[PDB]
């Protein structure tokens, strides 16, 4: 254990290694509970699973005139157009998707796949993304996701697009069966592993204990996923979410989202070399309240660790699988 | 339908980091502390204690993220899974002996110290290392848990990922248009006018049209320099004068001592410091949290880390609130 730095070949990044150093269960004027009145007026249903509501306050309009052409390399601008939407997990505020049974979070599975079906017919890049804990600026505790669908390829697609592109022609595998292929054989960094589903702590992991979640077989986009793999997810997403949870005896806080191929049009279009996967970035670092800030030298040079990603994987396999 | 970016989402590109943003453009510290590390006349962690010093002060971080020696790792055997050596210095700058002051509060000569320091340590380091990565995190906000004024300077053997990029990109700019990047960037901005923040003799600040933070700013020379030693006398002088404007506009825009990370960028260093760094322009950058107000801030999280940065505040609607401020301190 040296210090060094490693590269992250997905987002083509590298990273220095300093390896020598109470919620109601409901709330009527939550506008996210069942039967609640959301901002432009509409009263929730009744719902006793998940529910899916266009964002009132939304980043992306689906209808947006287009910047004129640009008249200078250092002054581009292109036109953007998309959805938001909100899902909401479970009617429960008070439940996150560790406390959640399979079957519950099979149906979060299911609503992910069908938002990601509905929207990708309109929109090439479809962004799934939970954003958990005051800590990560969530102001609303209910169970929930939003949904960013989008005109434009997002920037971190464009990169993953061009590091996979690049992978497959060059190796003839997609890098990300690659990866969970020598994972798999290299042990050290693994998680779990279930019949369809492994996560791991990244070589080139940046937070203190992000993990990656991907399917074992190869699998371009969310709705592909068999009825079985998905019940497996279920289950290795609540093995995952509970060791975190006991990692330091706190609902643990994290941004995470799902890459898949991109959607829209797909007539001329190869996307065998994408895979499936998912990202969880977590800031807790210590305890329930130290956490690590990613500020000065991670902002002007490079993303920096102590904790290597050996022992971090180490220290979330050991967690048990009961919630504490 | 008419576009205007004020009233109409978008996205823009960052052409020195290669990056793109999308645009919603539709929505009390004592004086002094015996045992304040960071004071005149403390003890560090180390046991050594401080002298009384009156201006600067300069040491060797005792909790450093690099050390000089290290073995480098073996060979890779797979293109997945590559390491390399890393090797460097991390030292810790205070700006004045009172713990009390920030940079905005500071005199002009005092400042002017600061930045004779910061180029006596890039001039020093930057002989053994290829980078001198000078930058200051202010606030709690940041992370910050010390709050006498100081700043970090880490150098490394390594190029870091941000100092690769901007290195690709300049190079690149100046291989097709013939100019550094930055320079046409300047001459661009000073003639658009509208993302500038204050223009001196020898220095701008503007929101730079690519900015992710609400209120980021871009400070650069308006002489073509690559580091940061070669500013002459004047030059340091009025970078110390436009700082403390900067600074105090920044203070003023929410009556709060405001935080932010911020950091100099300049020619790679080291061994190859004779190559050609033509490409190159000094600067530095802003990166501040706050959004709306002392205490609401921009999380840079879910989207923004699954996607793509994103603002709501355009740099021209943030550029035009800055220019509005004082430059006299609340
Ligand atoms: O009445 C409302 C309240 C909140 N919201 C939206 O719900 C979202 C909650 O998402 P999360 O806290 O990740 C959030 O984007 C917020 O703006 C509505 O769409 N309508
Ligand atoms: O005794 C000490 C205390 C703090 N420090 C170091 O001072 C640094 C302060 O830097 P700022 O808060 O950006 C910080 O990195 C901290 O580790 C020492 O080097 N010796
Ligand atoms: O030196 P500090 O204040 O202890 O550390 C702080 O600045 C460092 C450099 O940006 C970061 O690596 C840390 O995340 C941050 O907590
Ligand atoms: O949707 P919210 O909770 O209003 O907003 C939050 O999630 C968004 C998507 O990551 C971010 O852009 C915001 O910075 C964050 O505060
Ligand atoms: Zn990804
Ligand atoms: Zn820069």
């Given at each position: 254990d040296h210090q060094h730095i490693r590269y992250?070949?997905?987002?083509?990044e590298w990273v220095l290694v300093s390896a020598h150093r109470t919620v109601p269960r409901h709330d009527p004027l939550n506008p996210l509970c069942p039967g609640a009145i959301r901002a432009n007026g509409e009263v929730n249903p009744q719902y006793d699973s998940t529910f899916l509501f266009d964002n009132d306050?939304?980043?992306?309009?689906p209808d947006a005139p287009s910047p004129g052409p640009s008249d200078h390399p250092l002054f581009q601008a292109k036109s953007a157009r998309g959805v938001c939407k909100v899902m909401c997990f479970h009617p429960w505020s008070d439940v996150t998707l560790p406390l959640m049974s399979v079957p519950e979070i099979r149906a979060v599975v299911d609503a992910w796949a069908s938002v990601t079906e509905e929207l990708g017919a309109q929109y090439p890049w479809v962004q799934i993304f939970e954003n958990k804990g005051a800590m990560m600026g969530?102001?609303?505790?209910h169970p929930h996701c939003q949904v960013w669908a989008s005109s434009f390829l997002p920037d971190i697609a464009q990169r993953e697009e061009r590091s996979q592109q690049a992978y497959k022609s060059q190796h003839g595998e997609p890098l990300l069966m690659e990866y969970s292929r020598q994972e798999l054989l290299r042990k050290e960094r693994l998680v779990l592993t279930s019949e369809h589903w492994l996560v791991l702590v990244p070589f080139w992991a940046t937070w203190p204990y992000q993990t990656l979640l991907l399917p074992r077989?190869?699998?371009?986009?969310?709705?592909?996923?068999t009825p079985a793999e998905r019940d497996d997810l279920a289950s290795i997403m609540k093995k995952l979410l509970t060791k975190y949870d006991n990692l330091f005896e706190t609902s643990f806080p994290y941004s995470m989202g799902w890459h898949g191929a991109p959607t829209g049009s797909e007539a001329g279009?190869?996307?065998?070399?994408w895979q499936l996967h998912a990202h969880y970035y977590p800031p807790l670092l210590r305890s329930a309240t130290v956490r690590k800030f990613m500020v000065g030298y991670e902002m002007l040079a490079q993303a920096q660790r102590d904790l290597t990603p050996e022992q971090a994987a180490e220290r979330l396999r050991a967690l048990p699988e009961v919630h504490y």
């Open positions: 992250n070949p997905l987002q083509d306050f939304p980043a992306l309009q969530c102001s609303n505790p077989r190869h699998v371009r986009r969310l709705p592909e996923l279009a190869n996307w065998n070399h």
